[PDB]
Amino acid sequence: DEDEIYRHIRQALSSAPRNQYTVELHLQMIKYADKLEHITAKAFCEGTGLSQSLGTEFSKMRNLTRRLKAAGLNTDLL
Amino acid sequence: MDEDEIYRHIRQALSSAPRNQYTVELHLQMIKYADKLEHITAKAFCEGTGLSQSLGTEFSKMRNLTRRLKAAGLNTDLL
């Protein structure tokens, strides 16, 4: 499961234009955070091809996602 | 809503949040009001909300997520 998720994230990021990359990165983190609750930020960056420096950003987005879902976000639609 | 009243809503939510929820609340408030603040710079956002200019980059990131988040069902009235 996690490896399929990482492939989907990589396909989305590799396809994003430069000026949409940061947005797409954050949206992919939010999209899958609820299926990756058990993973470390380090493992997330390794799986997706991201610099390990982005780990804190994943940790932030994973916390944010719980509150966005409570406000109606359906992460399947991202 | 005038921009300053939006800033006051953000300041009030930040003041009301527990310390251990501050950073999440800040990002949620940025998302909540980004689309009513489309005309402001991140510098003006930080000045209006009493935040360090170093947080401007956080507003720049969050404000550009709203279109896709709302299309996926996010109701900012619930934030």
Residue numbers in the entry:
A (entry chain B): 2 to 79
B (entry chain A): 1 to 79
The authors write:
Here, we describe RptR (RMS-proximal transcriptional regulator), a small transcriptional regulator of a defence island in enteropathogenic Escherichia coli composed of a toxin–antitoxin system, DarTG2, embedded within a Type I restriction–modification system (RMS). We determined the molecular structure of a RptR homodimer and, using transcriptional reporter and in vitro DNA binding assays, show that RptR represses the promoter of the defence island by binding to a series of three direct repeats in the promoter. Furthermore, we demonstrate, using the structural models of RptR validated with electrophoretic mobility shift assays, that the minimal RptR binding site is a 6-bp palindrome, TAGCTA. Both RptR and its binding site are highly conserved across diverse bacterial genomes with a strong genetic association with Type I RMS, highlighting the role of RptR as a novel regulatory component of an important mechanism for anti-phage defence in bacteria.
Consistent with analytical SEC, RptR formed a homodimer of two helical monomers each comprising four alpha helices (α1–α4). In contrast to RptR, the dimerization interfaces of HTH regulators are typically distal to the DNA-binding domain. Leu74 of one RptR monomer interacts with Leu69 and Ala72 from the other monomer, and vice versa.
